[PDB]
Amino acid sequence: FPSHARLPRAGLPRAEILAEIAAMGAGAVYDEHHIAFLNEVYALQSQSNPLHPDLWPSTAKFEAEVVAMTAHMLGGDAAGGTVCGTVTSGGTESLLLAMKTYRDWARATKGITAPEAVVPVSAHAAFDKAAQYFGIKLVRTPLDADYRADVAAMREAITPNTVVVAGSAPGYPHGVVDPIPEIAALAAEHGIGCHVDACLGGFILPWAERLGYPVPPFDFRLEGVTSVSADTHKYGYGAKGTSVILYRRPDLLHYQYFIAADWPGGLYFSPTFAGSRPGALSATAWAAMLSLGEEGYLDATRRILQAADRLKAGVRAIPSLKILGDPLWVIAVASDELNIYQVMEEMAGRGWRLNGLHRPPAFHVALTLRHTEPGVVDRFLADLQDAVAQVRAHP
Amino acid sequence: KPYRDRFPSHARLPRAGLPRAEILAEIAAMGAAESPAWRDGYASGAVYHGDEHHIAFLNEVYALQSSNPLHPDLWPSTAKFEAEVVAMTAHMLGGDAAGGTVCGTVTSGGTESLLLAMKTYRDWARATKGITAPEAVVPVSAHAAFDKAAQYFGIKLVRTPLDADYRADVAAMREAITPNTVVVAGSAPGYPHGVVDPIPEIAALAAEHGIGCHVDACLGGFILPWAERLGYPVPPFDFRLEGVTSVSADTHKYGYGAKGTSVILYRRPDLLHYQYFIAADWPGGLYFSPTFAGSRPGALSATAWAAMLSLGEEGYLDATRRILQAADRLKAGVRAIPSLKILGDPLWVIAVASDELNIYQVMEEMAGRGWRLNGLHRPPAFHVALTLRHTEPGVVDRFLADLQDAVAQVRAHPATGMAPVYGPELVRQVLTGFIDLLYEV
Numbered sequence A: 001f002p003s004h005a006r007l008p009r010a011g012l013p014r015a016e017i018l019a020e021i022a023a024m025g026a027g028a029v030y031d032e033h034h035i036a037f038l039n040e041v042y043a044l045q046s047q048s049n050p051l052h053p054d055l056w057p058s059t060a061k062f063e064a065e066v067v068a069m070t071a072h073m074l075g076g077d078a079a080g081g082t083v084c085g086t087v088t089s090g091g092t093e094s095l096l097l098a099m100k101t102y103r104d105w106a107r108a109t110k111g112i113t114a115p116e117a118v119v120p121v122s123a124h125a126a127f128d129k130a131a132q133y134f135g136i137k138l139v140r141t142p143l144d145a146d147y148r149a150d151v152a153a154m155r156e157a158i159t160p161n162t163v164v165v166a167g168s169a170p171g172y173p174h175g176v177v178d179p180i181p182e183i184a185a186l187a188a189e190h191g192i193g194c195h196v197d198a199c200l201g202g203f204i205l206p207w208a209e210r211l212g213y214p215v216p217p218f219d220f221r222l223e224g225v226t227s228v229s230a231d232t233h234k235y236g237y238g239a240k241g242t243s244v245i246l247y248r249r250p251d252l253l254h255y256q257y258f259i260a261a262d263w264p265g266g267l268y269f270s271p272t273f274a275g276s277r278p279g280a281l282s283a284t285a286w287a288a289m290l291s292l293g294e295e296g297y298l299d300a301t302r303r304i305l306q307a308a309d310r311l312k313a314g315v316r317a318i319p320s321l322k323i324l325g326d327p328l329w330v331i332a333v334a335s336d337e338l339n340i341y342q343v344m345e346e347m348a349g350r351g352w353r354l355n356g357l358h359r360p361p362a363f364h365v366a367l368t369l370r371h372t373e374p375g376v377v378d379r380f381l382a383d384l385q386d387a388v389a390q391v392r393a394h395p
Numbered sequence B: 001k002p003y004r005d006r007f008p009s010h011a012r013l014p015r016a017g018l019p020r021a022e023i024l025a026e027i028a029a030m031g032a033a034e035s036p037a038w039r040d041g042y043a044s045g046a047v048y049h050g051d052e053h054h055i056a057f058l059n060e061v062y063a064l065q066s067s068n069p070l071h072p073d074l075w076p077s078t079a080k081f082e083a084e085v086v087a088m089t090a091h092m093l094g095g096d097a098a099g100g101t102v103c104g105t106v107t108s109g110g111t112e113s114l115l116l117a118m119k120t121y122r123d124w125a126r127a128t129k130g131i132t133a134p135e136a137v138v139p140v141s142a143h144a145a146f147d148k149a150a151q152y153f154g155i156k157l158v159r160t161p162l163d164a165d166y167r168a169d170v171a172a173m174r175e176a177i178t179p180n181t182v183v184v185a186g187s188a189p190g191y192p193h194g195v196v197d198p199i200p201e202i203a204a205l206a207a208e209h210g211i212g213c214h215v216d217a218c219l220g221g222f223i224l225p226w227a228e229r230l231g232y233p234v235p236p237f238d239f240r241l242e243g244v245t246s247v248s249a250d251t252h253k254y255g256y257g258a259k260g261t262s263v264i265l266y267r268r269p270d271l272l273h274y275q276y277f278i279a280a281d282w283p284g285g286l287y288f289s290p291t292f293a294g295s296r297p298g299a300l301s302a303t304a305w306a307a308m309l310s311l312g313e314e315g316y317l318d319a320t321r322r323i324l325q326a327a328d329r330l331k332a333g334v335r336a337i338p339s340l341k342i343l344g345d346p347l348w349v350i351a352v353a354s355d356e357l358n359i360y361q362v363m364e365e366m367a368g369r370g371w372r373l374n375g376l377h378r379p380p381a382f383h384v385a386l387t388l389r390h391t392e393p394g395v396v397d398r399f400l401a402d403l404q405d406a407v408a409q410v411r412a413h414p415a416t417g418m419a420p421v422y423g424p425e426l427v428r429q430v431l432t433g434f435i436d437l438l439y440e441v
C-alpha cells in the first residue's frame, strides 16, 4: 500500500480509504455479533466527549453506572456505600492515577515528601512509570516458591515514607493471585494505602469464586484494600480504551481530581489524566456490561476457566514443560530442561502469538473466550507437543 | 442528570443480561435528545466537524479497526496509521525546516501532548543540565493542562502577564526565566481568548537561553497553516523557527479526526527519547511505551489517518476558509453591538466581554435562547469557538440576532439564572462536589 509521508493535495475517495483499511484487516482480543453490537453503540455515541457533560449527560451516566456496577462486583457494599471511583482509559491510567493519588494523599495527610511504594517484583511495569512520572521510590519485593508476593519481604520493606503497597489479582507475568488479604492487612496495620491491581482479574475472579474455583478475597471485602483497578475492555468485554479505578472512600478519590480556579479559560476540572476524551468508548463498556449481566460473565468465565483446566492438564502432561505457580486462566510455561524461547519460536512458526517472559524465561498464554472455541486448546496442545519434540532434538 | 426518571438507573450488574436491542435503544434515545445542540451549531467547540456523512465515514473506519498498538505485531496496520499521521502533521508544521529530524507520537489528546512535553523537558533537563528543581514559564493564558503537568511531575510553573491585546508579554517572560527554567511555551492560539502569542520572539528567548520552547497548537494546529496560506495574518508559530523545540496539535479538534486523538512533535529525536518509557527486567518481558497509555485504542488512530487523507490540503483549506469567513462575519456583527467588546484580535475563537454590562447575564440570556458557549473569567466574558457547524447557513446570523436581543434585555435589567454561579478554594470544594454529582447514581 502507498505510504503517506505528507498530506495529499486532493483528498482521497472515502471508498478507497476504507478499502485499504479493510484490506489490512483481512490476550490482545478478549465474537462477530458482540463486536458488531459494540460497534453500533460506538456509532451512536461517536460525537460524545465527557469533558462537556452539559452536552453529553448520556455519557456522564454511562460512566457513573459502569463505576457503580463494577464497585458492587468488587465488594463495594462491604465498604458501606463509600466506595467511589472513575472511568479511566486503561489499566495503566488506573494504576498511574492511584499512585499519583496515594502520593498526593500522603503529602497532605502524613507530610510525606519522599514517597515510597512497595510492590511485588511481579507487579505490572506501569508501576515503574508512575514511579518515574510522579517521583515515587518504587521498591519491588521478591516472590515466593509459587510465585506469589512474599509478604514478609514486603513487611521488611515498608518505611515511614511508604505511602502504599500493592498486590496483583492476578499479576500479568505468571497469572497468579497475590496474598491480597495479608497484604491489605500489612497495609492497614501501618496506615498506608493498599492498592489491588485487578486489571486482568477484575471481571473473571468474582465469578470464578462463585464458580467453585479457589480465589482469595482480593477486593473491598477487605478493610485494608483502599483502592482497586479493573479493566472493562479486556475481560469486561467492553471495547478497547476503557477501565475503572475505585477507592474505598471519597476522601481518597478527591486527591485524584485536578482543579484549576483562576485560569482565564474558566473554571477547569478533570477527574482523570485526559481532558477531552471519547465518551463513545464509555458507552461501549456500559453496553457490554448490561448486555452480559451476571449470567453473561458467569458463563464466559466458566468457559474460559474450563479451557484453562484442559490446557494446564495437557501442558503438565509433558515432563519437560513446567507451569509457573498455580494460575487459573493466564498461564506461564517454562522448561528447566529445554530452551523455552525455542519452544515458543517453533510454536510461533505454527501460528501462535504468545508473550515471551523473562526472569525467569518462559512464554505465557492469556486464555480468552477465543480459546474456548472448539479444538482450539486441542490444537494448542498438539502444536506444543510437536514443538517440544523438535527442540529436544535440536538444542 | 435529566434521564434520572426517563431511563432505569443501574447501580449494580443485572443478573440476566439485557437485550442488545433494548440497550441500543436507550443509547439512541439519549442521542436523540442530545444531537441537535451540537449538530445545529449551538455549541462552542465540542463538535468540530459534525457532518452526517463524514461522521458516518469515520464510524465505519472505527468499525474496521475495532485493535491496539501495544501489540504492533498483531496490528502493524495501526503502527502505520500513527506513523503516517505524525509524518503528515509534522510536514504541515514546518517539519522540513528542521531538516528531517522532526519526530513525534500520537497521544490521546491535547492534554497528553502537553503533559508528555512537560515531562520530557523535565527529564531532558535533568539528564542534560542537571536541573532538579525544574521550572516552566508560560503565559497566564496558557492552557490549564500546564498546571496539571506541574503538579504531576513536580515542575514549578510560572505564569507571566499578558499585554494590552491579550498576547503573552515576552519581556515579563524573559524576566521570569531562571537557571532552573527548562522550557517556555506559547499558545497558537490560546483557548481563553483565541489569540496567537508572539511565538517568534518566545522561541528566540528560548534558544538564547538554551531551554525548551513548546508551542501549544492544539487548537490552531490544523487551521493556522491554511489561514496563513489564505491571506490572514498569522506569525510563524511552528518548526520554521529554530527555537521551537516541540509543538502539539489536536487531530481530533480541527484535524476533524474522531475524538480521543492528538499529536506531540519534537524538533529532534534526542528529545523524543526522553518521553519514551522502558522497563528491562520486569518478569513480564521487555516493556516499552511511547506515551502515558499502555494499551491504546488503535481504532481512534485510524480515524485520524482516515480523516486527514480524506480531506487533504484542499479539504483543510476549504474548511478553514469557511470557518474564518464565518468568524469575520461574526466578529463584525459583535463589534457593531454596543456595548460589547472582543478581547484581543482573534481569528476564529472569539472572546466577547462588556465593560458596560454583566456579560455573564448576556451569556445566560443567550443560553436561554439555546446556545452552549463557554464562560471565561479574569476577565469576565464568554467565548465562541467557531466550528464547521457555524459555517452553516443563517447560523452566524441567528447568533448575532439572538445576541442583539440578549444585550437589549440586560441593558434594561441589571439579572439571574446560571449567571450568579460563574460570578478560590470554595471553587475546589464546589467543583469536586460537582464531579461527584456527575458520578452519582
Ligand SMILES: [Cl-]
Pocket: A276, B045, B046, B047
Ligand atoms: Cl472541546
